[PDB]
Design an enzyme around this catalytic site. Structure first.
Site, PDB file in Angstrom:
ATOM      1  N   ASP A 130      45.520  87.238  51.032  1.00 49.31           N
ATOM      2  CA  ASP A 130      45.055  85.981  51.623  1.00 49.31           C
ATOM      3  C   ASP A 130      44.872  84.911  50.565  1.00 49.31           C
ATOM      4  O   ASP A 130      43.891  84.164  50.574  1.00 49.31           O
ATOM      5  CB  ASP A 130      43.776  86.194  52.430  1.00 49.31           C
ATOM      6  CG  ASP A 130      43.449  85.017  53.334  1.00 49.31           C
ATOM      7  OD1 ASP A 130      44.344  84.184  53.564  1.00 49.31           O
ATOM      8  OD2 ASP A 130      42.288  84.932  53.794  1.00 49.31           O
ATOM      9  N   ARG A 134      41.758  77.729  50.031  1.00 48.87           N
ATOM     10  CA  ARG A 134      40.464  77.956  50.670  1.00 48.87           C
ATOM     11  C   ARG A 134      39.734  79.158  50.092  1.00 48.87           C
ATOM     12  O   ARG A 134      38.505  79.239  50.237  1.00 48.87           O
ATOM     13  CB  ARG A 134      40.645  78.104  52.191  1.00 48.87           C
ATOM     14  CG  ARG A 134      41.233  79.418  52.619  1.00 48.87           C
ATOM     15  CD  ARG A 134      41.402  79.535  54.140  1.00 48.87           C
ATOM     16  NE  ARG A 134      42.775  79.949  54.406  1.00 48.87           N
ATOM     17  CZ  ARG A 134      43.193  81.209  54.463  1.00 48.87           C
ATOM     18  NH1 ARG A 134      42.342  82.216  54.499  1.00 48.87           N
ATOM     19  NH2 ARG A 134      44.494  81.456  54.496  1.00 48.87           N
ATOM     20  N   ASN A 135      40.439  80.072  49.412  1.00 50.79           N
ATOM     21  CA  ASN A 135      39.858  81.278  48.837  1.00 50.79           C
ATOM     22  C   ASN A 135      39.698  81.194  47.325  1.00 50.79           C
ATOM     23  O   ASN A 135      39.539  82.224  46.662  1.00 50.79           O
ATOM     24  CB  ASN A 135      40.685  82.495  49.214  1.00 50.79           C
ATOM     25  CG  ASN A 135      40.290  83.044  50.561  1.00 50.79           C
ATOM     26  OD1 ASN A 135      39.119  83.001  50.974  1.00 50.79           O
ATOM     27  ND2 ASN A 135      41.270  83.545  51.276  1.00 50.79           N
ATOM     28  N   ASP A 148      37.677  85.898  47.926  1.00 47.29           N
ATOM     29  CA  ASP A 148      38.184  86.239  49.264  1.00 47.29           C
ATOM     30  C   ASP A 148      37.027  86.160  50.244  1.00 47.29           C
ATOM     31  O   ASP A 148      36.099  86.964  50.171  1.00 47.29           O
ATOM     32  CB  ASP A 148      38.844  87.614  49.298  1.00 47.29           C
ATOM     33  CG  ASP A 148      39.534  87.885  50.621  1.00 47.29           C
ATOM     34  OD1 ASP A 148      39.418  87.033  51.555  1.00 47.29           O
ATOM     35  OD2 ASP A 148      40.179  88.976  50.740  1.00 47.29           O
TER      36      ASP A 148
END
Ligand SMILES: Cc1cn(-c2cc(NC(=O)c3ccc(C)c(Nc4nc(-c5cccnc5)nc5c4cnn5C)c3)cc(C(F)(F)F)c2)cn1
Length: 269
Positions: A130, A134-135, A148
Site C-alpha cells: 500500500d 498517504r502512507n 502503513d
C-alpha cells in the site's frame, strides 16, 4: 522482545484517526510527543494477532526512513502501539497544502529517503502493498518515513497485483513510481478523474501518466521505468536509491527538464 511501555507514561490527548478496532491519538510519552494506536475491548483473535504482529515487525525495523516504534502496551487493556510523532503529517496532504513551496532538490531528496526506506523493507523481505503518499509521514527536517495506516488503491497498484494478487517488492516499485509522480506534482490525484476501470484499461492499452510540470528529465525517466508491464524489467530499489543519490550529489543533473505537454493553449501577441 518489543519495548513494553507502562500505561501511566502515556497521555492520550487528541483523536487523529481510526484503526482496525480502535482509535489513533496524538499524545505524550514520559514528555515526547507520540502517536498512539489502540485495540479496544472486543477485538477478535485475528485482530490481536494482526495488531501484535504489526508491533513486532515495526519493532524490528531500525531505519531513518521507516516510522520508529517507541513501544507497545500489551500487558494492559486497551493495548497500544506507540510511535514517534511526525509534526507535518501525511505527505499527500502536506504537499497539497504547500503547493510550489519547495525546490526540485528538496522534492528529489524526499524521494531518495522514501526509496531508501523501501530498499530496507524489501531487503528485510517485507512487502508493503500500500505504498502511496498517504502512507508516508514527514518530520520537521523534511525526512519522509514509510508507514502503513491501513486502507482498494487500484491507482497505485501494479497490474500483476491487481490481476492475480501477486504482491512483491517489484509491485512496490510500481507504487513507488506513482509516489514519485505524487511528489513532483505536489499531491495531484494520479490519473485525475479517470475511474478505477478506466485506469486499468489505460494501463493495459499502454498509456502512462504524463510528465509533471517542472520535472527533471532523469526523474521522469526513472518513474517510467518503474511502470514497465513486465515485472522483471523494473528497477530494484537498490537501483532507484543509487540513481537518486547520484542525481542529488550532482545537482546540475536535475536542471534538464522533461517537456511538459500543455493541456491548454493560450495565444497572446
Ligand atoms: C505485519 C504488518 C506490518 N505492518 C506495518 C504497520 C505500520 N504501522 C504504522 O505505520 C503505524 C502504526 C501505528 C502508529 C501510531 C503510527 N503512527 C502514526 N500514525 C498516524 C495515523 C493517522 C491516522 C490514521 N492512522 C494513523 N499518524 C501519525 C503517526 C505518527 N505521526 N502521525 C501524525 C504508524 C508500518 C509499517 C511499515 F513501516 F512497514 F510501513 C508496516 C502492517 N502489517
Amino acid at each position: 522482545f518489543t519495548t513494553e511501555i507502562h500505561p501511566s507514561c502515556v497521555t492520550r490527548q487528541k483523536v487523529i484517526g481510526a484503526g482496525e478496532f480502535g482509535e489513533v491519538y496524538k499524545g505524550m510519552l514520559k514528555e515526547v510527543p507520540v502517536a498512539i494506536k489502540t485495540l479496544k475491548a472486543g477485538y477478535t483473535e485475528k485482530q490481536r494477532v494482526d495488531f501484535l504482529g504489526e508491533a513486532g515487525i515495526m519493532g524490528q525495523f531500525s531505519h531513518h526512513n521507516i516510522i520508529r516504534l517507541e513501544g507497545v502496551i500489551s500487558k494492559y487493556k486497551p493495548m497500544m502501539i506507540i510511535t514517534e510523532y511526525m509534526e507535518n503529517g501525511a505527505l499527500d496532504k502536506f504537499l497539497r497544502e504547500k503547493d510550489g513551496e519547495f525546490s526540485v532538490l528538496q522534492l528529489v531528496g524526499m524521494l531518495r529517503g522514501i526509496a531508501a526506506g523501501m530498499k530496507y523493507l524489501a531487503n528485510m523481505n517485507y512487502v508493503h502493498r500500500d505504498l502511496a503518499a498517504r502512507n508516508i509521514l514527514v518530520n520537521s527536517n523534511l525526512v519522509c518515513k514509510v508507514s502503513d495506516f491501513g486502507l482498494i488503491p487500484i491507482r497505485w497498484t501494479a497490474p500483476e497485483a491487481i490481476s492475480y494478487r501477486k504482491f512483491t517488492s517489484a509491485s512496490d516499485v510500481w507504487s513507488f513510481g506513482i509516489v514519485m509522480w505524487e511528489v513532483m506534482t505536489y499531491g495531484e490525484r494520479p490519473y485525475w478523474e479517470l475511474s478505477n476501470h478506466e485506469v486499468m484499461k489505460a494501463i493495459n492499452d499502454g498509456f502512462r501518466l504524463p510528465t509533471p510540470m517542472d520535472c527533471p528529465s532523469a526523474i521522469y525517466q526513472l518513474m517510467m521505468q518503474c511502470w514497465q508491464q513486465e515485472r522483471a524489467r523494473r528497477p530494484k530499489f537498490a537501483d532507484i536509491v543509487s540513481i537518486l543519490d547520484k542525481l542529488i550529489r550532482a545537482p546540475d543533473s536535475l536542471k534538464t527538464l522533461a517537456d511538459f505537454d500543455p493541456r491548454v493553449s493560450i495565444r497572446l501577441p
